Design a protein around this ligand. Sequence first.
Ligand code: MG
Ligand code: MG
Ligand code: MG
Ligand code: MG
Ligand code: MG
Ligand code: MG
Ligand code: MG
Ligand code: MG
Ligand code: ZN
Lengths: 115, 83, 68, 178
Amino acid sequence: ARIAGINIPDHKHAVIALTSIYGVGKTRSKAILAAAGIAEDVKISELSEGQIDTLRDEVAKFVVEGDLRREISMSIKRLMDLGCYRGLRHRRGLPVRGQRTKTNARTRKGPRKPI
Amino acid sequence: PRSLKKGPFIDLHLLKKVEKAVESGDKKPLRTWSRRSTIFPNMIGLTIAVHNGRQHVPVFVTDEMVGHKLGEFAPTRTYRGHA
Amino acid sequence: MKKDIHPKYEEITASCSCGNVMKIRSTVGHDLNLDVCSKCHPFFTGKQRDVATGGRVDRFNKRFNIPG
Amino acid sequence: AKLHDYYKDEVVKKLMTEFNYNSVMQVPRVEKITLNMGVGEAIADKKLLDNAAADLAAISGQKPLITKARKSVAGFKIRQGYPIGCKVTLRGERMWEFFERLITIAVPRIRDFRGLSAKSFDGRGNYSMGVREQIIFPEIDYDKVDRVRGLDITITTTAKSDEEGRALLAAFDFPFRK
RNA sequence: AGGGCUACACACGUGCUACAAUGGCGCAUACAAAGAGAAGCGACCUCGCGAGAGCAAGCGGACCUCAUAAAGUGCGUCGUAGUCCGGAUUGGAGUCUGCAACUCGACUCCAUGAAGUCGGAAUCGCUAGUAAUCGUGGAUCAGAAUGCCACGGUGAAUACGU
RNA sequence: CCUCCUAAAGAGUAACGGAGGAGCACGAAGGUUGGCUAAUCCUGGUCGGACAUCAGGAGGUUAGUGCAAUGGCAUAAGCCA
Ligand SMILES: [Mg+2]
Ligand SMILES: [Mg+2]
Ligand SMILES: [Mg+2]
Ligand SMILES: [Mg+2]
Ligand SMILES: [Mg+2]
Ligand SMILES: [Mg+2]
Ligand SMILES: [Mg+2]
Ligand SMILES: [Mg+2]
Ligand SMILES: [Zn+2]
């Protein structure tokens, strides 16, 4: 199935199959399935192309995939270009939301760099 | 962040001093220690010398800073790498 | 065009979700139900627009409604 | 086909009526469409060159020319005569049908399509764009794909200038970033 | 008054959460013990997806409130995949407390979905209601526990021997 | 043994004079018929980068010749079938 611009996994159940879209998680997929009137347990491969079409049509009101990547990049780029504290943490690759950097900043700082 | 039912926060000394500045067309920097005050749209075009601990960093106010505290544009800690 | 070298080029029908029925030759070998067309894409229809990238003052005034 | 007849019916007159051509065949026409896959790692595996050749044979209507290295290069560890590319030129009715198939199906199948660049001309009215993935074409399914693979499309036209080539492809409703 | 004690090429100790199927999730349902409470615990009803808000009963307490315990059980689903595992990080929107939440709070929602598939040399605890795990409460405290102190639920293995 | 210079515009011409190569390779890298033209640079173009491949332009042999140097070579002696 081709909802938004990417390929949905056909062998899985609708809810998880739809969560494979940048911008749709479990509860947003549940809301999409509940507004479409399709069970979440039905496989996407076992439902008709009209159901695929309305699934696409009400995925389309959620800003998702590349538009969401554009919005997220634009927000982080606005912070970095503005040069606030969150901007300098994004520029230096340090944690932004007040976590400790003496230890355990490893997700933001990448793997360990020996001196 | 602060609740929307309580409004935004701004220190009065600054609010009155920037009303005076935007009323008289003051172009001297607004010297302040109030890093906790939310930027309002009446600081647009003025430079605010916000304290950071040891000197007043002057930050010129643009359209994108509205809704941010004054202290985000004054970095308090100095760090220039380790080795 | 050589004969026994090339892939089979048969005429099939391409149909969009918007009801765009269409006759094109290709190497698919079956009729297909594609999902975006050139009468259907937001860039082709002009519906893409842009991101906001501004309105911080309007966001402030909308979320606060303060006197002064 | 639909676009050669479209071309011959309105695109010729449209260009005439704005460019003030003194002759009928001073109008730009497209000459050929050339598809190129620069495989590269065929030296590591000759079989994926055959996979990319089958991909280009599915994407176009024709079998591709397996294209060897022109001169020996150390930095990619190739020798002269080592097969590293796939080339198809379409050039006629299959060019017009591929131009339809591209403009109508494959370009709106591009993930995150914000528009094709209008600065992607050579300076002599010939256009070149890069397809990032062969799945944008519906000739190959999502299932039997060994690896992702893009390609290069160049429209070689008759036009002598940048503005002519830009003005001609827009007469066929080409998605320029505008 | 503002900043710092919260920094960050790195090294170590002590924890927490995991890498999953003896499990994840969804619905229904069973069984605690100890404790706290007046600038406090705050029902019921209404509103909010939620954090929570409004109105407001009772309670200086075997009475009222915090506070329908969780693992378990039953049905379904996932089917061995970096996954419906994991939940780090980040963007946007918020709630509460406090003069004030930028440095530098907790929590909620939506999106994001990092490392990790049982860990080298080495090393720790524990002999029974113990270890392992599963929740609960208190002090400190305007707010701010994965820490500490305490409380129950399930509940082993193994000790020839010096 | 081969090539250039010395070598004085026919040939030839010495030095423990100045510079370099050979002791092979190819049943195609030979014959013929048909066809084709290079280097390098620029501008575009998925990964792709200084340099792989594609397209156009400038350029005009600055390439190529199985191997040194010299003389040849577009009717190509160069490249392909
Ligand atoms: Mg002080
Ligand atoms: Mg189960
Ligand atoms: Mg999970
Ligand atoms: Mg008591
Ligand atoms: Mg990994
Ligand atoms: Mg002579
Ligand atoms: Mg003579
Ligand atoms: Mg020869
Ligand atoms: Zn359509």
